[PDB]
From TrEMBL, chain A:
It comes from the Bacteria. The chain holds residues 105 to 161 of 173 of the full protein. It comes from Caulobacter vibrioides (strain NA1000 / CB15N) (Caulobacter crescentus). Zn(2+) binds at C14, C29, C39, H42. This is Cell cycle regulatory protein GcrA.
């Protein structure tokens, strides 16, 4: 569970959903997560870990 | 062992070229070559 609902979501806050939106309790983390939609604890699990990609140009 | 370069038979053209370039590491030369080939693109060591 988080510490902020879908209404009290301000700028520079975590937005990783927890639970089911069609459920009773559905909130977000709501922590210090500036310069990014998700938090630092979930930024490494959401995006592709170990980014290794390259091509020609 | 210092050098063998006179001014009558051999020239210092190859040695002088090492003082005009600012690239030292191989990655620097690779990035410069990639920028010269594909201009206007962020070069990476992998590509
Ligand atoms: Zn989160």
């Amino acid at each position: 569970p988080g510490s902020a609902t879908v209404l009290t979501l301000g700028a520079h806050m975590c937005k990783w959903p927890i639970g089911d939106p069609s459920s009773e309790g559905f909130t977000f983390c709501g922590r210090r997560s500036s310069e990014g939609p998700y938090c630092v604890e979930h930024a490494r699990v959401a995006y592709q870990p170990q980014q290794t990609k390259k091509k020609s140009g | 062992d210092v050098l063998d370069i006179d001014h009558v038979t051999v020239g210092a053209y190859m040695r002088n070229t090492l003082r005009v370039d600012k690239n030292a590491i191989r990655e620097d030369a690779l990035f410069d070559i990639y920028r010269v080939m594909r201009p206007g693109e962020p070069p990476t060591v992998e590509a």
